[PDB]
Design a protein around this ligand. Structure first.
Ligand code: SKG
Ligand code: NA
Ligand code: NA
Ligand code: NA
Length: 244
């Protein structure tokens, strides 16, 4: 009851929950950066091949194919591939790499968007065309001496990130770009019929990392969210710690 005591409990729990939110933020960050570093290394190894090894399709198969395969295995990626301007893609898939002409690669965001930036492009999660798993794709237009070779893609199962987030301490969770729930420590929050408005509205009012109160079934809860890339990361807890 004494306001000194309530303030002490509030300040403690704000610190604790902030810390835990930041661990889930770090988890998302480190997943991305590891995948980006991998993709960058692969780009470098492909671009360091002589032009002769890159300028016929049979040479791409025989010289780039093994690189795609070893890299895929190193990280247990689902697919690793190189898309060419003739519409063919050299594909190393979890199951030697094949040059596929039937995958409509120029319709794909991972292909188109890699040509519009000099960075790595990271897709939202989507259902892979070939293996029918949900993946996050990292793509990169590879140039040698300023000349485009093709677009590299690396597909990592989105489950990998979901699992990493779920293992974190705290009642933390992630929304995707469209404010749909994406990952959670408590698997029940993944019910698509849960309304997240209260938290999402309190986030909009308060901003990144700003602790707020809200109600659930007439009881008080405390939480915070923050943007992490296109995701929104949140933590919530009961306010019993400060009230009882
Ligand atoms: C090669 C390319 C078609 C991949 C299978 C990519 N994950 C996609 O679904 O667009
Ligand atoms: Na890294
Ligand atoms: Na690796
Ligand atoms: Na957690």
């Amino acid at each position: 009851i004494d306001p000194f005591t309530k303030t002490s409990l509030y300040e403690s729990t704000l610190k604790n929950q902030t810390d835990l939110l930041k661990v889930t933020q770090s988890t998302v960050e480190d997943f991305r950066s590891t995948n980006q570093s991998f993709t960058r290394a692969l780009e470098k190894d492909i671009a360091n091949l002589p032009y002769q090894s890159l300028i016929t399709e049979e040479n791409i198969i025989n010289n780039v194919g093994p690189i795609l395969k070893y890299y895929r295995h190193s990280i247990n990626a689902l697919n690793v591939y190189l898309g060419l301007n003739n519409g063919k893609v050299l594909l190393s898939q979890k199951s030697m790499p094949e040059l596929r002409d039937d995958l409509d690669i120029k319709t794909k965001d991972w292909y188109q968007e890699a040509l519009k930036t000099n960075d790595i492009f990271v897709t939202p999660a989507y259902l892979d065309t070939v293996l029918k798993q949900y993946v996050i794709t990292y793509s990169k237009a590879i140039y040698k001496d300023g000349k485009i070779i093709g677009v590299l893609g690396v597909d990592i199962p989105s489950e990998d990130l979901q699992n990493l987030v779920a293992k974190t301490p705290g009642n933390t969770f992630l929304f995707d770009q469209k404010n749909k729930i994406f990952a959670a420590t408590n698997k029940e929050l993944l019910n698509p019929s849960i309304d997240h408005s209260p938290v999402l509205n309190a986030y909009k009012l308060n901003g990144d990392n700003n602790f707020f109160s809200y109600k659930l079934n007439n009881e008080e809860r405390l939480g915070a969210c923050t943007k992490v890339f296109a995701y929104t990361a949140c933590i919530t807890e009961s306010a019993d710690i400060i009230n009882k």
